[PDB]
């Protein structure tokens, strides 16, 4: 019938759900202090509306980037790995991994906090790209993302040592193809026996349609402020919605699992490493 969060916890402890696939969005990283620049005001948003931006999405479109890359690099400075720590939400996913329950983590985020939390690259699909590598927009030469950090943190537009063209981190912009590693979804979502969706409004495609790729018998658990996407307008009989604060929803599931003090210990140890 209609499942509960407790019911999901029982399937996880019973290893009836042993191949969990996870989809995450910006909602799991604002608790780390990453400013939600999508939100009007507060505040980078208002400071960054001072450019001649046609629309706010042009910060992630190549035609505008070629015109003026300064808006992008201003925002990159602040999202760049190294200034933020993962939060309980990230460490919950690392704990699933430690317990051998995590089949794959699909992330829309570019803050790199999944890798930092201790999830290995083999278990991760960074569907919208990464700051870990960069590419000259003129000659197409690839670089390690480390090669541009100093320029980025210093408010300088990084330029290519070969042709002096603008070097762009390997973030997927709107209109660009997703990395071919995204094709793992063809195998991962049918192999899933549970789908978790955390902290996203499912407004970016093709990522959002992955919610539909699990088999008919597979529960889909949404932990999110709002009911969104196919869980709103194409619900299935084993869907579960834990609507509210993402951190609160996760911690409630951790409690029903019986993992609260294992989580506390894990978080304390890993954040201390900084």
């Amino acid at each position: 019938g209609k499942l509960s969060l407790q019911d999901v916890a029982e399937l996880i402890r019973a290893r009836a759900c042993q191949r969990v696939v996870v989809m995450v969005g910006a909602g799991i990283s604002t608790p780390s202090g990453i400013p939600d620049f999508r939100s009007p005001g507060s505040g980078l948003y208002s400071n960054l509306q001072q450019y001649d931006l046609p629309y706010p999405e042009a910060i992630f479109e190549l035609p505008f980037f070629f015109h003026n890359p300064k808006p992008f690099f201003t925002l990159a400075k602040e999202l760049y790995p190294g200034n933020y720590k993962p939060n309980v939400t990230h460490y919950f996913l690392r704990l699933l991994h430690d317990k051998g329950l995590l089949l794959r983590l699909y992330t829309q985020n570019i803050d790199g906090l999944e890798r930092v939390s201790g999830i290995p690259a083999s278990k991760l699909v960074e569907a919208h790209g990464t700051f870990a590598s960069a590419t000259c927009t003129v000659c197409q030469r690839p670089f390690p993302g480390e090669d541009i950090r100093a320029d980025v943190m210093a408010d300088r537009v990084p330029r290519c040592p070969v042709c002096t063209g603008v070097v762009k981190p390997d973030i997927v912009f709107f209109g660009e193809p997703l990395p071919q590693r995204f094709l793992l979804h063809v195998v991962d979502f049918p192999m899933a026996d549970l789908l978790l969706i955390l902290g996203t409004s499912l407004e970016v495609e093709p990522f959002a349609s992955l919610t539909e790729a699990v088999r008919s018998s597979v529960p889909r658990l949404l932990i999110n402020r709002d009911l969104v996407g196919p869980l709103a307008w194409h619900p299935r009989s084993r869907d579960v919605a834990q609507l509210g604060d993402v951190v609160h929803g996760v911690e409630s599931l951790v409690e029903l699992l019986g993992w609260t003090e294992e989580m506390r210990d894990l978080v304390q140890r890993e954040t201390g490493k900084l």
């Binding site: 999405e57 919208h128 997927v172 912009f173 709107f174 209109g175 660009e176 193809p177 997703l178 407004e203 970016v204 495609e205 093709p206």
Partner: peptide, 9 residues
């Protein structure tokens, strides 16, 4: 060379 989209593509 297209695929990513939001709110209209």
């Amino acid at each position: 060379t297209a695929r990513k989209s939001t709110g209209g593509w």
